[PDB]
Design a protein around this ligand. Structure first.
Ligand SMILES: Cc1ncc(C[n+]2csc(CCOP(=O)(O)OP(=O)(O)O)c2C)c(N)n1
Ligand SMILES: Cc1ncc(C[n+]2csc(CCOP(=O)(O)OP(=O)(O)O)c2C)c(N)n1
Ligand SMILES: O=C(CO)[C@@H](O)[C@H](O)[C@H](O)[C@H](O)COP(=O)(O)O
Ligand SMILES: O=C(CO)[C@@H](O)[C@H](O)[C@H](O)[C@H](O)COP(=O)(O)O
Ligand SMILES: [Ca+2]
Ligand SMILES: [Ca+2]
Lengths: 676, 676
């Protein structure tokens, strides 16, 4: 009460002092949201000493620039983050980076800062919670009953990705999602009147959300707590709580854009402290009564988790099969020998498009690995991402699925699908989740994909129609730059399998992943089964498909161009040129192999030509010369497009012959060599 | 009447026959939207023989997969597109590609197919029209009074980019925008009930749009025409017309997802023809009464344009200064010697961040070039994109600006900003428009940026905070992959100027552009004025900044790393190594120079090391070894991040020395050489 007010002041002043010490960062939203943070964390169930308790409530700061607020809460509650870490806010190597990162910050569920992402991550956490609860809960066994609390600002509400995810969350009736809009009428460019005058509340009602409005969120923590209680009674709608706040509340500069994103003036900090009963000569004060009050809540939460552990033990007795499955998932382990379900092919099998091979893999592994769920952005019958016989993830009230379903209809929402996948991964419980679209439209989701990599989440894009091989839809659909973009992003495995065995290797990697997102670039068109491919060899990312001791040239290729390279080898033989072929289904996986393995694939002393029907960027890592497509495509029958751009056996052979000639009398060393 | 019905049938059957001949494409939405297309084009003012008449109404097919409908309208109205072109729908090299492309299709204002883009392009066309009208119209001189008509589907309404643009368009009170939702309750994955159950109409009202609902848009062309008349009376709101249609109307498979995206069965086409009075044995029928009726409307429109030409002549008499400016703009010519306003610097001038240099350029050229308008995605005081003293583009009713304003508050809406910029460029009248955000968040707009390149639109991104040099905001804000992504996209000039003179060259290129979008990657941090830079040399895209005959190594760098390379040259001199320095402010501009010019910059016989604090992808085009940053960044003071990653004079010198050693006794040829 008095202690509640002191806690709020403590939070506010820790945040302002952290910004002040860094002389960098964002004091405004922390000042405005400290009452709400105090109220929400008092309602949340969490263990600072076990950040991975699966039935914890989750908190996401979607307005991630406000992270001094989050860090202050985590410090006050005794997470593995201290006042000394706050004093190192925004400093190189600290645990308090300028935007929250789940890899570095204990209690940061996701990485935010790029606006709009966190609320979508919250949708995914809530989606996973609903699916998890439907899969495991039993009468008298509420294994999963947690909530997902999200703070977001005007910036997040302006980013289209949040509209996508909010439309979908309302459709999915996600009643355990409770989001709070920091309604402070200020963004970087000033008043929201200059660019953001829509009726946000009316829009959220149009999505099927419940609304609670708190008119004085600067002080009315009673109403904020009551809004949470109200939201919990509305079990079939996500709730948006409108928190009408003053940005920078208490500052001389409150209610202005100047308090958004720069440190307060020293005299402003002094009057903040004196107004709230603190010592203006002191920084980073933590009144012991605040610590005590917060510790009481932690102790209660720890007793809740202790009881949850006993509930889980009793669950394993009453439901031994589900209990063992749940234990395995919480231990982060896939089913024993699950990969024996992966399809295997021989060169005698028929040609198949890698999108169809992907369908077949999914159909075999989904029944074996319950923690696989996924969907498509309105391309299910084109991406081939649904296993026959599975049920869609939908609220049962719709009649269209159930929360125990495993297939998500994302609609035409690639960016939100990407960020929702990140939230599903962030939920934990070993979820291995995927999302289908055309490769060219993965680009719509770049904001989220990049965060999958930075956050180290094992999400998977099923990215079909990978090239000019899709044909008639034409250049607005045909990737050119796309693989280069994602390969140039740290920590993305970009698999472009050539055939059945390679597609199984790509899935083995994607599903086994624990820290690396995957993009599977798959074909519309049929490709032959290759002589020399296997799951084992393709699992190395790059391998020698056709070994030619005494090669005059090695052709390195991916996907649809491996078969082309093999056909070019035969043309070259007729010209008296001996070629080897390397298949490079994943450059990242290949890069992580030993130097000796990599040199066995790309040796010294032989010219290497790359062939891939998109950008040549990156390919000089593996080749001396590069045959690619650095112009936009065309609308026509796919074989005619390939002929137009000379991606034919003869066109490849011609460039291979020119490569052999270009290096005659030169000393050639592997592209893997470098000066540093 | 009877002729109206025959026209609608003609449109429907041309579209279905085009799909049938290609055995590829999308018959459903063309069948459903033919009544609306017929009605809208009858209300539109356009000249098939002058696609660039500046006061034409514009039409945008945002659901671009429905382009057989658009092509049928263009053929029937006598644009430079014939039945023979329709017979070549989706065929290599035809003028009827599988999605409309403004470069290839007469009467296609923009390139659509990637969902959500076209409606945003329409917002930009309407924005430009409003700004253009406010700038030039005078009493009795309605130089510009045209409308922007957009067709869009459920897919476009699900893509977040359309929410961004619709929020902004409602805020901007764009009363000459009239959009039509194809409300057919079907997408690729089936019924919209599976993923898209929001109250679209309520959402559009929340943005401040006017609504008209047409309950039977399969037949009620009277109500569609009346909806247009109603929309035109609402001058301070964009209008959404809900067209309740049956996808594939008339087909045996109408009302199903199967009619969305594959050819109809032959017997289905036969019964379509017989039901509508056509010969089932005939394809591509064009009844002469339809041609006649459409020609009447063209003739009336041509008389309207003829009168507009006389109005323009009278305008030039009454308002000679504005008239000459308008003529110049319609001739596609910038003001004579406008570039004399570009700022010029010497090495004696102070260090300045290239974001601040950009502000100064804009402040000098905006007063000289009226066709420059632009804005920022809620980063105006950080991107520095507004010239002091200019007025924002806002409806005057808000009191916050005027439609004659030149500065757009886009809000936190990068993707819509990108697509709106494309629409402003598509309007014509020599508009040279720009949009500011942080470089890392240009990625949120990749869907639109790619279309800027494919559409050949001279738009400009003012992309500040380009690297780890931004410091404390950390890795969620620091570009790594971003330049590689856009450089790998065909037809994007990616300028990364090092200093004042280079920044002026970058703007000279961006503003003179007529077919190439520009991204200007600009710094937060200060950089020195370079000895050896000039507008003239930087205008070549790459140039020798420090010439060293007898160089042991050449260091090629961009942006902030050019000064670093110059400092490394001094360290190397102390180690007995002579270096030259190349500055490469735009790789695309450089690539377009003559081979002899390029070789004068990157000669044979000398190792070349690239230095740029982001991905090394692409750099092997210009260098033998590459020093870059292929991992994510860090949150800290920027100079400490540079030190951590060894982007220091000593760290560059060390790698340069290792490069010299690596090539000792090797024959080195320019990276510009290739085997083919
Ligand atoms: C995708 C993206 N675009 C731009 C930014 C730059 N940026 C950070 S905060 C911010 C404005 C935030 O306004 P709001 O969310 O209302 O925060 P508040 O001012 O209330 O603290 C912007 C534009 C960003 N972080 N992410
Ligand atoms: C950004 C983007 N994502 C995905 C696609 C793939 N695609 C084309 S049409 C379409 C569905 C369109 O549904 P709707 O707009 O309702 O069209 P209709 O079925 O009514 O013809 C999809 C998902 C695309 N063209 N663009
Ligand atoms: O327009 C689009 C996607 O941009 C879709 O309809 C796309 O054209 C699909 O290829 C068609 O629906 C046909 O699908 P598929 O034969 O490629 O599986
Ligand atoms: O959080 C964000 C952007 O992601 C913004 O507030 C960003 O941090 C800006 O850098 C701050 O507002 C400070 O701006 P500036 O000093 O870099 O111009
Ligand atoms: Ca705000
Ligand atoms: Ca539809």
């Amino acid at each position: 009460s008095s202690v509640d007010q002191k806690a709020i002041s403590t939070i506010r002043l820790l945040a302002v002092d952290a910004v002040a010490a860094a002389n960098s960062g964002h004091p405004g939203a922390p000042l405005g949201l400290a009452p709400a943070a105090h109220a929400v964390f008092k309602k949340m169930r969490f263990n600072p000493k076990d950040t991975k308790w699966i039935n914890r409530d989750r908190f996401v700061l979607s307005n991630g620039h406000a992270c001094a607020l989050l860090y202050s809460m985590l410090v006050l509650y005794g997470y593995d983050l201290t006042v000394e870490d706050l004093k190192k806010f925004r400093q190189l190597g600290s645990k308090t980076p300028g935007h929250p990162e789940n890899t570095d910050v204990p209690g940061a569920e996701v990485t935010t800062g790029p606006l709009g992402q966190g609320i979508c991550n919250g949708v995914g956490i809530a989606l996973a919670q609903a699916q998890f609860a439907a899969t495991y809960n039993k009468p008298d066994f509420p294994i999963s009953d947690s909530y997902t609390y999200v703070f977001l600002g005007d910036g997040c509400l302006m980013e289209g990705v949040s509209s996508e995810a909010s439309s979908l969350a309302g459709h999915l009736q996600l009643g355990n999602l409770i989001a709070f809009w920091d309604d402070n009428k200020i963004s970087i460019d000033g008043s929201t009147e200059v660019a953001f005058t829509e009726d946000v509340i009316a829009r959220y009602k149009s999505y099927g959300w419940h609304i609670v409005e708190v008119s004085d969120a600067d002080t009315d923590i009673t109403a904020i707590a009551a809004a949470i209680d109200e939201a919990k009674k509305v079990t079939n709608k996500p709730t948006l709580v409108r928190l009408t706040t003053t940005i920078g509340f208490g500052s001389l500069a409150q209610g202005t854009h100047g308090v958004h994103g720069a440190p307060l003036k020293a005299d402003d900090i002094k009057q903040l402290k004196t107004k709230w009963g603190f010592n203006p000569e002191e920084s980073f004060a933590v009144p012991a009564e605040v610590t005590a009050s917060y510790n009481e809540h932690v102790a209660e939460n720890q007793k809740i988790q202790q009881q949850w552990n006993e509930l889980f033990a009793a669950y394993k007795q009453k439901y031994p099969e589900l209990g063992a499955e749940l234990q395995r998932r919480l231990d982060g382990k896939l089913p024993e020998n699950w990969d024996k379900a992966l399809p295997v092919y021989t060169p005698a099998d028929a040609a198949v498009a890698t999108r169809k091979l992907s369908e077949i893999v999914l159909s075999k592994i989904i029944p074996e690995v319950p923690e696989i769920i996924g969907g498509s952005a309105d391309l299910t019958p084109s991406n081939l991402t649904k296993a026959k016989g599975t049920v869609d993830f939908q609220p049962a009230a719709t009649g269209l699925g159930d929360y125990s379903g495993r297939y998500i209809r994302y609609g035409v929402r690639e960016h939100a699908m990407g960020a929702i996948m990140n939230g599903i991964a962030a939920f934990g419980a070993n979820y291995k989740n995927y999302g289908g679209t055309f490769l060219n439209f993965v680009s719509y989701a770049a904001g989220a994909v990049r965060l999958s990599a930075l956050s180290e989440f094992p999400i998977t894009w099923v990215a079909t129609h990978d090239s000019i091989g899709l044909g008639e839809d034409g250049p607005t659909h045909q990737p050119i730059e796309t693989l280069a973009h994602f390969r140039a992003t740290p920590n993305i495995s970009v698999w472009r399998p050539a055939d059945g065995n390679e597609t199984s290797a790509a899935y083995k990697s994607a599903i086994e992943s624990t820290h690396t997102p995957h993009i599977l670039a798959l074909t519309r068109q049929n490709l032959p089964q290759l002589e020399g491919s296997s799951i084992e060899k393709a699992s190395k990312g790059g391998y020698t498909l056709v070994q030619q001791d005494k090669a005059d040239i090695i052709i390195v290729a991916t996907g649809s161009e491996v078969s082309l390279a093999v056909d070019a080898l035969k043309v070259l033989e007729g010209q008296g040129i001996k070629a080897g072929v390397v298949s490079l289904p994943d450059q990242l996986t290949f890069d992580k192999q030993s130097e000796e393995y990599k040199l066995s694939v790309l040796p010294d002393g032989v010219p290497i030509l790359s062939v891939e029907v998109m950008s040549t960027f990156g390919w000089s890592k593996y080749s001396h010369q590069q045959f690619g497509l650095n112009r936009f495509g065309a609308s026509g029958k796919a074989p005619e497009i390939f002929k137009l751009f000379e991606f034919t056996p003869e066109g490849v052979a011609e460039r291979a012959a020119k490569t052999v000639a270009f290096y005659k009398g030169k000393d050639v060393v592997s592209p893997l060599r470098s000066a540093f």
